[PDB]
Amino acid sequence: TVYPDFDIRNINKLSKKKDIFDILSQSLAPSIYGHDHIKKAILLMLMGGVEKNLENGSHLRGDINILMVGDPSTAKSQLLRFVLNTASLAIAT
Amino acid sequence: LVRSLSPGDIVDVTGIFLPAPETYLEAQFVKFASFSLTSDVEERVMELITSGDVYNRLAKSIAPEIYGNLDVKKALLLLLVGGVDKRVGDGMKIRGDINVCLMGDPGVAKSQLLKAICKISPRGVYTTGKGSSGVGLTAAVMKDPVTDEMILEGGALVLADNGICCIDEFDKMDESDRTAIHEVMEQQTISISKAGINTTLNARTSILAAANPLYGRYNPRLSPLDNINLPAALLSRFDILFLMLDIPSRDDDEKLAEHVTYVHMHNKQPDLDFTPVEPSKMREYIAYAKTKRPVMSEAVNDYVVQAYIRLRQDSKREMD
């Protein structure tokens, strides 16, 4: 043979606050100081959009592609390693 | 039944599954011309003719997520059908396919128009320019791991026979990739002379390229021939040469933003003045019209000659 309620209540309780967007953004990379605008983009990227599917068959994308261009070793090499351990499915290439 | 299976056909091979002490299949019984004239299919075609305005209904049903470009969508409807292939008894085969090329700034949804015509056509293959070189576009001469015979694997211009060939990024292509394109748009053939195989394969495809400017945006101060990195020999073979320029306008941007938000909300098209045609019924109307071969009239021959004189006189005065 080959084999390939407590958590739900705590989610809806924290969602009632109006500051859940800044708290969850700073909790992704606590060791990386600053860069609050860059951490907010990784949050919406991991959640993903809505896969819009028409009736004729033409599907639309929903993923968010982020490109970082800057000086080497500026919260870029270490930032990519945190996303590989946070997401449930990630391939380091 | 031997000597009757051509490479590249879609038939229903009926046989028995007998193993070999490898598993083989003992053969027992063995496109647009394969669809039979079923009474149920003919009833659906007559429903669209009696509704009235069939040319404008099919021109707006294509690409429901793209607003505007009414003249650009009209040329895509004739690409699925095409003209007639008048074969002269002397030995001349007049090409009946239409060569349409889309140009302009990369922002008029060029990638969406190429993929929309590929899913509608039953034999359409979508490809790019840099991803498919001269080997993937023409034919790859690989080696058989069993019989050790040099076969001819079909690429993009071979598997899409009698269909529409979608080519993306026509300006970023290499010089060795435009060799087979010049032969398809003239003789609908592919001259292969590699690995001692000097055979010619037929390629009756509909090339639908999409060029892009070299400097990103279009420059009105420069000539149209210098802005696009394409020679004048390729523009002569193309029948229609569109140019969708992204002109900033407050009236066009307001109607386009409302159409995009309506698609990403209800996952459908906005309600217009007609019902959208499903792609399952559009293929039945195109295949039925391909069997009808219209003949040119004698009274309309004088208008074509007079139109060519006025078109040649206006192009000669605009040379400088």
Swiss-Prot record, chain B:
Domain MCM: 54-261
Motif (Arginine finger): 236-239
Binding-site residues, ATP 1: 67, 107, 109-111, 212
Binding site for ATP 2: 237
Superkingdom assignment: Eukaryota
Effect of mutating residue 110 to A: Loss of MCM2-7 complex helicase activity
Intracellular or extracellular location(s): Cytoplasm; Nucleus
Family listed: Belongs to the MCM family.
Subunit record text: Component of the MCM2-7 complex. The complex forms a toroidal hexameric ring with the proposed subunit order MCM2-MCM6-MCM4-MCM7-MCM3-MCM5; loaded onto DNA, forms a head-head double hexamer. Interacts with CSM1 and MCM10.
Miscellaneous note of the record: Present with 166 molecules/cell in log phase SD medium. Early fractionation of eukaryotic MCM proteins yielded a variety of dimeric, trimeric and tetrameric complexes with unclear biological significance. Specifically a MCM467 subcomplex is shown to have in vitro helicase activity which is inhibited by the MCM2 subunit. The MCM2-7 hexamer is the proposed physiological active complex.
Function statement: Acts as a component of the MCM2-7 complex (MCM complex) which is the putative replicative helicase essential for 'once per cell cycle' DNA replication initiation and elongation in eukaryotic cells. Core component of CDC45-MCM-GINS (CMG) helicase, the molecular machine that unwinds template DNA during replication, and around which the replisome is built.
Protein name: DNA replication licensing factor MCM7
Encoding gene (name): MCM7
